[PDB]
Amino acid sequence: QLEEVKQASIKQIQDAIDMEKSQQALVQKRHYLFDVQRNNIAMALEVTYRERLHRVYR
């Protein structure tokens, strides 16, 4: 009797805990992913403007 109660105990909470942890992660991480990409873009261009100024002044 007692075995099944504790056994079921792990398995039911497991599937929850894992899925609520999965849900929370994707929100921030996916917004971070978007973010980082914007990041990488912006940089390059100011660089491109910057480089032209050095080049022509030389």
């Binding site: 990409q37 990488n40 873009i41 491109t48 032209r52 022509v56």
Partner: protein, 66 residues
């Protein structure tokens, strides 16, 4: 000796004379020219054949992105 400035006079004279008769290599004669002409070319080589009386300007573009 004693002549300090009377010597400098002697040197001075020819400096003006040449300037007030400018032409070719200045009483030097062609000989200065023959070197000069090579030297002027060589210096062009150090900067390549980019014209120096022009102003450069161009546009510049973009590549792959993410």
């Amino acid at each position: 000796l004693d002549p300090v400035q009377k010597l400098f006079v002697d040197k001075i004279r020819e400096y003006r004379t040449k300037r007030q008769t400018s032409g070719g290599p200045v009483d030097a004669g062609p000989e200065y020219q023959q070197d000069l002409d090579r030297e002027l070319f060589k210096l062009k080589q150090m900067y390549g054949k980019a014209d120096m009386n022009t102003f450069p300007n161009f546009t510049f573009e973009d590549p792959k992105f993410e």
